[PDB]
C-alpha cells in the first residue's frame, strides 16, 4: 500500500519497530557512504603505488581522477538513496487507511499482549 507518512504511522511504527522508521534509513545511508569512501581511498592507493609508468609520473592526474570520481558518486548516491528514503517511508514502512480510520491501536496493543 502506497501512502503518505503521518504522525500516527511514525508513532505506531516507532512502537512496533522499537525505533523510528527513519533510523533504519540512517543506518543504510550512513553505511553506503562509508563504503563509498572506503572504495575510493582503496583505489587511489592502488594507483599511487603505480603512478609511475615507464619514466613519467602521473601522481597529479591520479589525485584529480580519483577525486573527480569520488564526487560523482557523492552526487549519484545522495540522489539514489534519497529516493530510497522516500520509497521506503511511503510504500514499505507504510500505513493504509483501513487501520488509522478505525483503530490500528487495537491490533498493536493486541500484538504486544495475547
Amino acid at each position: 500500500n502506497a501512502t503518505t507518512p503521518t504522525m500516527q504511522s511514525t508513532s505506531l511504527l516507532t512502537e512496533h519497530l522499537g525505533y523510528p522508521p527513519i533510523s533504519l534509513v540512517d543506518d543504510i545511508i550512513n553505511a553506503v557512504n562509508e563504503i563509498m569512501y572506503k572504495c575510493t581511498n582503496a583505489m587511489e592507493k592502488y594507483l599511487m603505488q603505480r603512478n609511475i609508468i615507464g619514466k613519467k609520473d602521473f601522481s597529479d592526474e591520479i589525485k584529480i581522477g580519483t577525486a573527480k570520481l569520488e564526487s560523482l558518486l557523492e552526487n549519484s548516491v545522495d540522489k539514489n538513496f534519497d529516493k530510497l528514503e522516500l520509497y521506503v517511508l511511503r510504500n514499505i514502512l507504510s500505513i493504509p487507511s483501513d487501520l488509522l480510520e478505525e483503530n490500528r491501536f487495537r491490533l498493536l496493543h493486541h500484538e504486544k499482549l495475547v
Binding site: 543506518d27 553505511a31 563504503i35 603505480r50 549519484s76
Partner: protein, 90 residues
C-alpha cells in the same frame, strides 16, 4: 503474502546498482585518467580497479545491509506487519 520485506531487499539492491553504474562504463573511467589510460600498463591498472571496486562495492554493501536487517529484525517486523494488515482487512 509476505511481500514487503522482499521489497526492502529490491529497493536496496536497486539503489546500489544505480549508484555504481557510471563506474561500470569504461569510457567515463578513462575520461578521469586520459593520459594515464593512454599507456598499456595504465589500461591494465584501471581495468583491475573498476572490476575490483565494483566487487568491493557489492560485497561490503551486501554484508552490512544483511547485518543491519538482522540487528533491527526488519524481516520479521515487516512479515508481522504484512500478515497483520491481512488479518485486519479480514
Amino acid at each position: 503474502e509476505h511481500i514487503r520485506f522482499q521489497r526492502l531487499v529490491q529497493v536496496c539492491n536497486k539503489a546500489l546498482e544505480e549508484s555504481i553504474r557510471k563506474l561500470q562504463s569504461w569510457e567515463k573511467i578513462h575520461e578521469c585518467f586520459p593520459n594515464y589510460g593512454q599507456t598499456r600498463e595504465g589500461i591494465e591498472n584501471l581495468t583491475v580497479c573498476q572490476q575490483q571496486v565494483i566487487k568491493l562495492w557489492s560485497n561490503l554493501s551486501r554484508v552490512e545491509f544483511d547485518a543491519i536487517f538482522h540487528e533491527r529484525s526488519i524481516e520479521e517486523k515487516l512479515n508481522q506487519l504484512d500478515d497483520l494488515i491481512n488479518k485486519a482487512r479480514s
